[PDB]
């Protein structure tokens, strides 16, 4: 069908590569494709250059190299291996005493490599590293809350690279310095820098009472060396103030370009703010034997000038996105790399003392264990390294562009308040105002705006078009927040004739504040409305019509859309759904021009102009982290002529290259018999019949056979006391055959384990003797099927020890994996949502004969209750339906861009053209207006919907332009007493499906210490009946019900055993006994040397252990 696009906005630049924030960050850190001599000092390179040379003997760093991966990406995922490259480093050993030089290339372990789409493979699982927002290093000045006329200057370096500093000015009048939460007079530190009373008086003095308050005579009564010793006694009480020891402490804390690192952004922000230029990233220097100041005096100078009200001095807003920067993958990994390198150096210095000061090379001197652990620690356990969200291609694309304020070096949950969670004015065009979690994390986790990119310093930049005179150039400038506030920025929709601003009054911003301005005053202009919102928000058509709280739900839920076998793109798109599939890397494109030689289910072979017969294998039914099927399908035919960049295969949840998160269904908006109540949804059985909303899902099962002190676990088809009916679908070896239907209780992999000293009790001995069957040496441990799961066995992997290429963790003979698939039809309790935030569970599936239908016999698909619209204020879904109605009959799909879209009149033109096909067909087919259509028209003119005094066709078209049609109830045949809104809507099936969530337990596993039921469905747990639930039972006064919850249904052991026996014998359950978790409480208080005594009414002790604990 035809695709009609609305909107007048010409976007001068396309969206940037969307995963570039990941790819570019790590490529810059490793520089693997750069020749060593040409590397800039950044990332991995910078870490080596910082840690070396290592002093005593001197070990010096030459260069590093990265090898190729031992195994390819697919292979790593299979074998539970990390995708990584071997790292080597060339080191030269120098003897500071002798002259000796031994040089060798030492192996430092492996480093994980990033794939093409911006993710990692860590132990077989695909992972994402989330960027971290934090306060930029630099020098800031904030108002002191206590004294309304004074200020604090804070010098903050990069995280873990130095202390926080506070320069409060105390009530006594002297300027104080705060380091590691301890305070002293700042004048003392100034003298150590070699400052004299003259320098401070002549430099500053202009502020009469402030500069004199810093002056303290006792401090001046000593040369720079004595003042250094004096300060050290303040910071480290009890440590003897040896001159080399004091220098070492203060140097490492202040001047050392190893223990103190301002940022590269810190240097720029400091140089720019104080109007000085920094020679390095440290606050001071050690030069010609004494200390020479860099930062401290300019920072003191700015503070006094600010307190006095000198022009050009302002306080800094700490949530401004110019003073807040992003820490990307490379930077996070490099920080952990730097820690691991410094630890290895501890091993080097300590080994340069023990064992002979001569017979050592660099290869024996280096133990790489500290480095390997730090990198492995970061990737396998950091709280920024997350399990990839790959439910559908958009899930992972969004995951990679997220920004977290949490994690190692940032806010905690308990540690976080309003200023940080707010939407700052500088978020415009940089961080999406919509896409954030609802609940406790609101505002801490956000998403990168679509046109934003992170610069080399770590500040988020956004594009704007230059405007010279009144003419808008095509030159685009990416701006930081600090630089953006200088200019006057017009809105992207301001009218244009050609390249000229066509309005006499334009809508613009100056420092985020909205302002009306004449075309003479316009310096820049927005590139597009798209630049303000995240990628998910940009996928919501008619967004200009949706309340923000609901738009949020629309964004977040597209992440949760399950790939459907029949998946289709929405009939109303925003025009981004093409780009998302392409940047995600889910689909497949042609490298150069060529002709398709072969097309298969498994592969596509293309013959290019070059003559090379490139073969593209297709990924078929691979199981993602969330168990949705990632599978690619061929879109071309043998001999098809393709150009460069044309589609070859469609990925999951994509249709002919457009993002398909759901299906397009015909919807009626109307109550239906209370099956619509409070957001529930009623659907037509026609949807299951034609396999709409069916999705494939795969669950993975695994079992190990290991060596025990009692003998080997063996995976075998021979399992004690089981009938042949039970083993039928098992192969020779005890593994289920590929292509079998397995249901709950069925054996997947047979296994036997050797019986413990529980070697059968005499009760079992006599029973076994009666039947004349020896009690077997092994017991049945077979892997089976959990309650509620099962499907078709599609694959088996078996890995033993002593087979090529495989070695398991110690003690493990063999590992078997069984992949089981299921086709899931939509059912009652599965969850649906559209892009505007209407979400609900399927409560009823009616047979097609009950569904409301159009006069021409077509039944509707979904019935949504109108009560969900007005309080929610998400109207985009309404406009989406109307344009969807026209498209149903005209056979078209639309692109309506956000904020430059299809407007109401334009949709009306399209709706009228549809009516001709819905009606004109009928008038020609020899049918006139229906009797019931008149009855509804009667009711409609009482409503003011149609104008009185027109032919039925004239009135029906009037209703059709309001998006309403006559609807017949399939139960009665009578019309709905009014015209009903009907049209095509895009609705997705989300990841929350009852099959996954239904759970129940009679009795089951218990915890070790408490003897209470376990938690969670996978453990067959019991439900938690918590403090508030007990209150509920208490307020009702249901004491025996409550007592059951506290005893027989949990940790009362004598009672719960006895209660079960009663139910199976038909007796009533016994009165409960003492709960075991109370006995634990008693014994734990005894371990604290407290005597807890249960007493009777006579004040005599009562023994709740029934004699077992007393001698």
């Amino acid at each position: 069908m035809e695709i009609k696009r609305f909107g007048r906005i010409r976007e001068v630049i396309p969206l940037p590569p969307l995963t570039e924030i990941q790819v570019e960050s790590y490529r810059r850190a490793l520089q693997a494709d750069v020749p060593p001599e040409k590397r800039e000092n950044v990332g991995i390179q910078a870490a080596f250059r910082e840690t070396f040379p290592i002093e005593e003997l001197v070990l010096d760093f030459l260069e590093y190299r990265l090898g190729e991966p031992p195994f390819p990406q697919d292979e790593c995922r299979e074998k539970d291996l990390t995708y990584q490259a071997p790292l080597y480093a060339r080191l030269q050993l120098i003897h500071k005493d002798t002259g000796l030089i031994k040089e060798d290339e030492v192996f430092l372990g492996h480093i994980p490599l990033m794939t093409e789409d911006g993710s990692f493979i860590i132990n077989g699982a695909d992972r994402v590293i989330v960027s971290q927002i934090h306060r930029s290093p630099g020098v800031y000045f904030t108002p002191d809350p206590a004294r309304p006329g004074r200020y604090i200057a804070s010098i903050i370096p990069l995280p873990k690279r130095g202390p926080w500093i506070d320069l409060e000015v105390e009530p006594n009048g002297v300027v104080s310095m705060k380091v590691n939460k301890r305070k002293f007079p700042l004048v003392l530190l100034l003298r150590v820098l070699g400052y004299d009373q003259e320098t401070l008086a002549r430099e500053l003095g202009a502020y009469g009472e402030l500069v004199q308050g810093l002056m303290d005579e006792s401090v001046f009564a000593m040369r720079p060396e004595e003042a250094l010793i004096r300060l050290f006694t303040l910071l480290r009480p009890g440590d003897p103030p040896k001159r080399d020891k004091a220098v070492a402490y203060v140097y490492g804390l202040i001047a050392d370009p190893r223990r103190y690192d301002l940022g590269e952004a810190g240097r720029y922000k400091a140089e720019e703010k104080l109007g000085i230029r920094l020679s390095g990233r440290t606050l001071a220097r050690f030069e010609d034997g004494e200390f020479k100041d860099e930062v401290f005096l300019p920072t003191l100078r700015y503070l006094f000038a600010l307190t006095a009200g000198v022009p050009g001095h302002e306080v800094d807003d700490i949530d401004h996105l110019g003073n807040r920067r992003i820490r990307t993958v490379g930077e996070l990994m490099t920080d952990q790399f730097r820690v691991g390198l410094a630890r290895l150096a501890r091993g080097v210095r300590e080994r340069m003392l023990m064992g002979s000061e001569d017979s050592l090379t660099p290869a024996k001197l280096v133990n790489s264990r500290p480095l390997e652990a730090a990198i492995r620690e970061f990737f396998s356990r950091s709280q920024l390294s997350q399990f990839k969200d790959e439910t559908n291609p958009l899930s992972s694309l969004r995951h990679k562009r997220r920004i977290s304020a949490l994690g190692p070096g940032g806010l905690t949950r308990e540690r976080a308040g309003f200023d940080v969670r707010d939407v700052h004015r500088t978020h415009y065009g940089r961080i999406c105002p919509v896409e954030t979690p609802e609940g406790a994390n609101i505002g801490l986790i956000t998403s990168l705006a679509a046109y934003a990119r992170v610069d080399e310093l770590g500040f988020i930049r956004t594009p704007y078009r230059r405007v010279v005179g009144g003419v808008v150039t095509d030159e685009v400038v990416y701006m930081t927040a600090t630089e953006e506030d200088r200019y006057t920025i017009a809105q992207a929709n301001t009218p244009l004739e050609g390249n000229r601003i066509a309005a006499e009054r334009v809508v613009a911003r100056r420092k985020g504040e909205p302002v009306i301005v004449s075309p003479e005053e316009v310096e820049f202009m927005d590139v597009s409305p798209k630049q303000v919102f995240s990628v998910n928000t940009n996928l919501i058509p008619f967004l200009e019509h949706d309340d923000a709280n609901r738009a949020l739900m629309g964004s977040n839920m597209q992440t949760q859309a399950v790939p459907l076998i029949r998946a289709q793109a929405p009939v109303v798109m925003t025009g981004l759904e093409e780009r998302v599939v392409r940047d995600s890397l889910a689909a497949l494109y042609a490298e150069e021009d060529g002709e398709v030689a072969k097309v298969d289910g498994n592969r596509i072979v293309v013959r290019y102009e070059d003559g090379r017969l490139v073969e593209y294998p297709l990924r078929r039914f691979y199981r993602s982290n969330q168990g949705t099927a990632l599978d690619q399908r061929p879109r071309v035919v043998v001999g098809q002529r393709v150009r460069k960049g044309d589609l070859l295969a469609d990925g999951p949840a994509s249709e002919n290259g457009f993002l398909a998160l759901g299906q397009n269904v015909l919807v009626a908006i109307m109550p239906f018999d209370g099956y619509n109540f409070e957001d529930a949804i009623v659907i037509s059985e026609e949807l299951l019949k034609r396999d709409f909303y069916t999705s494939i899902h795969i669950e993975r099962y695994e079992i190990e056979a290991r060596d025990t002190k009692l003998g080997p676990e063996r995976i075998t088809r021979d399992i004690p006391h089981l009938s042949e009916a039970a083993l039928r679908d098992l192969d020779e070896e005890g593994v289920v055959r590929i292509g079998a239907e397995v249901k709950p209780g069925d054996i997947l992999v047979g296994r036997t384990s050797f019986k413990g000293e529980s070697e059968p009790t005499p009760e079992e001995r006599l029973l076994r003797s009666i039947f004349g069957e020896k009690a077997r040496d092994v017991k049945d441990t077979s892997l089976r099927v959990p309650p509620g799961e099962g499907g078709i066995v599609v694959r088996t992997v078996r890995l033993r020890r002593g087979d090529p290429g495989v070695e398991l963790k110690p003690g493990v003979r063999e590992v078997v994996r069984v992949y089981v698939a299921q086709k899931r039809k939509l059912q009652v309790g599965d969850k649906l949502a559209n892009r505007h935030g209407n979400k609900g569970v399927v409560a009823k599936i009616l047979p097609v004969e009950d569904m409301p239908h159009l006069p021409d016999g077509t039944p509707v698909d979904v019935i949504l209750n109108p009560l969900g619209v007005p309080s929610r204020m998400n109207l985009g879904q309404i406009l989406e339906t109307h344009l969807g109605l026209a498209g149903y009959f005209l056979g078209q799909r639309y692109i309506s861009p956000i904020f430059d879209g299809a407007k109401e009149p334009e949709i009306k033109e399209l709706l009228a053209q549809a009516f001709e096909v819905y009606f004109g067909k009928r008038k020609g087919e020899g049918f006139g207006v229906d009797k019931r259509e008149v009855e509804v028209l009667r009711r409609a003119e009482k409503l003011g919907l149609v104008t009185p005094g027109k032919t039925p066709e004239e009135q029906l078209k009037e209703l059709f332009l309001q998006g309403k049609v006559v609807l017949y109830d399939g139960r009665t045949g009578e019309p709905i007493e009014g015209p009903i809104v009907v049209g095509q809507m895009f609705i997705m099936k989300l990841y929350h499906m009852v099959e996954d969530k239904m759970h129940a337990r009679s009795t089951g596993p218990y915890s070790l210490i408490t003897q209470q039921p376990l938690g969670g469905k996978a453990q067959f747990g019991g439900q938690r009946f918590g403090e508030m639930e007990v209150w509920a039972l208490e307020a009702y006064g249901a004491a025996h019900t409550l007592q059951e919850m506290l005893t027989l249904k949990s940790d009362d052991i004598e009672g719960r055993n006895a209660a079960y026996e009663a139910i199976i014998k038909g007796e009533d359950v016994p009165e409960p006994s003492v709960p075991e978790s109370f006995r634990v409480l008693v014994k734990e208080l005894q371990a604290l040397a407290l005597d807890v005594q249960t007493l009777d009414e006579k004040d005599n002790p009562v023994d709740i252990f029934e004699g077992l604990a007393s001698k």
């Binding site: 018999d673 209370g674 099956y675 619509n676 109540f677 409070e678 529930a680 039970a726 249901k743 709950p744 209780g745 069925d746 309650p787 509620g788 009652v828 309790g829 569970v841 399927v842 409560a843 239904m998 129940a1000 337990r1001 009679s1002 079960y1060 139910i1063 199976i1064 014998k1065 038909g1066």
Partner: protein, 49 residues
């Protein structure tokens, strides 16, 4: 949870598979009183698969 308009105020819809687990001891006793299984132990073995 799913809405159930047809229920009277004192009722709820309970999936049969959930009810079988929650009442399992009761179900075992009743299966012996009528006749689906010889005794309590065999009846439980039948519900496993």
């Amino acid at each position: 949870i799913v809405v159930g308009p047809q229920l009277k105020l004192h009722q709820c819809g309970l999936p049969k598979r959930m009810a079988l687990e929650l009442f399992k001891p009761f179900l075992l006793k009743k299966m012996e009183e009528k006749g689906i299984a010889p005794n309590v132990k065999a009846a439980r073995r039948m519900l496993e698969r």
